[PDB]
Amino acid sequence: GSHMTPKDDEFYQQWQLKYPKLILREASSVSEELHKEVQEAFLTLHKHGCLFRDLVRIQGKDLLTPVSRILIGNPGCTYKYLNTRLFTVPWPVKTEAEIAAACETFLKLNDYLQIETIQALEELAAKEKDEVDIKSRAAYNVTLLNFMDPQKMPYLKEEPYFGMGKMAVSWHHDENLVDRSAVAVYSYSCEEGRDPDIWHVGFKISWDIETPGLAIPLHQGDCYFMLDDLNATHQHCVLAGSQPRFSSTHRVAECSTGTLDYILQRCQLALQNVCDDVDNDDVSLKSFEPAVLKQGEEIHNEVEFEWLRQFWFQGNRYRKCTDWWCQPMAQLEALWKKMEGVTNAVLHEVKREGLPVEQRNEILTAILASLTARQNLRREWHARCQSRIARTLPADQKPECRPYWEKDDASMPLPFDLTDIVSELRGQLLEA
Ligand SMILES: Nc1ccc(-c2c3ccc(=O)cc-3oc3cc(O)ccc23)c(C(=O)O)c1
Ligand SMILES: O=C(O)CCC(=O)C(=O)O
Numbered sequence: 001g002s003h004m005t006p007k008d009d010e011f012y013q014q015w016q017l018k019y020p021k022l023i024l025r026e027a028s029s030v031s032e033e034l035h036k037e038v039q040e041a042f043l044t045l046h047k048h049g050c051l052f053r054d055l056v057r058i059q060g061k062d063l064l065t066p067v068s069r070i071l072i073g074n075p076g077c078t079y080k081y082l083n084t085r086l087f088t089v090p091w092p093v094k095t096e097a098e099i100a101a102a103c104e105t106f107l108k109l110n111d112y113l114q115i116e117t118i119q120a121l122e123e124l125a126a127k128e129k130d131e132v133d134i135k136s137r138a139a140y141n142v143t144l145l146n147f148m149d150p151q152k153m154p155y156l157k158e159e160p161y162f163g164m165g166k167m168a169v170s171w172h173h174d175e176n177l178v179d180r181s182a183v184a185v186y187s188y189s190c191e192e193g194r195d196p197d198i199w200h201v202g203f204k205i206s207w208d209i210e211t212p213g214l215a216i217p218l219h220q221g222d223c224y225f226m227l228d229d230l231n232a233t234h235q236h237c238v239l240a241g242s243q244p245r246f247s248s249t250h251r252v253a254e255c256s257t258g259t260l261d262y263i264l265q266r267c268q269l270a271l272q273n274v275c276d277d278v279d280n281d282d283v284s285l286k287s288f289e290p291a292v293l294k295q296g297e298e299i300h301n302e303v304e305f306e307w308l309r310q311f312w313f314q315g316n317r318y319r320k321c322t323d324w325w326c327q328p329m330a331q332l333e334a335l336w337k338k339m340e341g342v343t344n345a346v347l348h349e350v351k352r353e354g355l356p357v358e359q360r361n362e363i364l365t366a367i368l369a370s371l372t373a374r375q376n377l378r379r380e381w382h383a384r385c386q387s388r389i390a391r392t393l394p395a396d397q398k399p400e401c402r403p404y405w406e407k408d409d410a411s412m413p414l415p416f417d418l419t420d421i422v423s424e425l426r427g428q429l430l431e432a
């Protein structure tokens with residue numbers, strides 16, 4: 001396989017024909033005011049130690065990301081990538097001053113790229129011959145900031161299909177975005193085919209290593225845009241240059257189950273089955289209808305694994321840049337605590353003498369999948385907090401396996417290990 005750069009005559013026609021949805025707006029087209037401001041913001045944020053490598057999970061393997069990052073965006077919003085839920089350090093939509101200033105900066109960058117994107121989608125629709133679709137597909141709600149110093153890596157991976165050389169980030173799609181939403185990137189480089197010293201973004205068509213890929217050079221302050229279905233039909237990578245580089249990748253996160261407000265509302269829904277006169281250990285339930293119980297235990301898992309464990313796995317490295325999620329995480333944890341009491345109550349009702357076995361088996365069938373999953377995921381999370389590489393990470397932001405309590409701890413109604421309880425309930429349902 002081979003690739004094209006501006007050095008090739010075919011590059012330009014290839015781009016115009018097979019990539020009308022990829023746009024480049026060079027540093028020139030953006031005000032020097034903005035450049036200085038966002039570059040300063042990157043640099044303060046780096047100096048404050050705000051960007052972290054993530055301890056992600058891909059195809060069974062625990063991996064540190066070579067790139068270090070921080071998520072910034074709408075308050076209460078989250079972005080899930082490579083099985084890791086990033087929580088926004090918030091920007092001032094309708095903290096240590098400096099850090100708050102940088103977030104405001106990236107908010108205005110966001111406004112600018114949003115305008116540019118709408119503009120480009122308008123021109124794109126015009127060449128193809130509804131403005132709600134356009135504005136929603138450009139309504140960026142977060143940006144994921146990236147940093148890599150390539151001299152810090154002992155050995156970089158070779159781009160395997162087209163000879164593009166060294167890769168900072170492998171071929172992928174930006175995942176979990178609103179359908180056909182655009183992606184806008186501000187690239188900031190600290191400065192026989194593609195020049196190894198310059199950073200490039202690479203592109204290929206999915207499934208296809210015969211059509212030569214493109215490597216677009218990125219100089220300081222250059223911006224690129226992926227429009228409409230480009231991010232789905234094509235893969236992209238990042239090709240390392242000689243110097244360090246920052247980037248700001250503004251996206252429309254699909255967040256329909258990804259906001260604080262959403263998960264709080266799910267918790268409230270589970271707790272509608274609970275007599276709520278008073279908050280004590282005496283949890284009593286309004287109903288034991290299978291469908292209501294299933295839902296409650298499903299929500300129990302949702303808040304526990306998508307929110308609590310995800311959050312605390314990141315070693316609380318937010319209080320380094322914000323405390324916005326502190327009380328929300330305390331509130332969710334308490335809501336999850338009550339839900340522990342709920343599961344206990346359901347177990348108590350199952351073991352109760354005087355319950356017709358038909359109603360007992362109706363309940364078991366409703367909750368077994370949830371308690372099973374709660375066991376399996378709890379093991380995964382516990383392993384993932386010990387493991388090989390979790391060893392190394394600085395104790396100042398190393399994975400905490402929260403919530404966690406010992407067998408001896410009697411502030412909690414149930415044990416962390418549910419294996420006994422799962423076997424016992426699975427046996428009863430087979431009792432013929
Ligand atoms: N240790 C690593 C962990 C993750 C990735 C990586 C990927 C590695 C493999 C892959 O198929 C997709 C990847 O997508 C990424 C997206 C990001 O925003 C950041 C990193 C990746 C990589 C990589 O780029 O090869 C290495
Ligand atoms: O930095 C870029 O240009 C693309 C962003 C990216 O691939 C990433 O790190 O998620």
Ligand SMILES: [Mn+2]
Pocket residue numbers: 174249
């Ligand atoms: Mn990317």
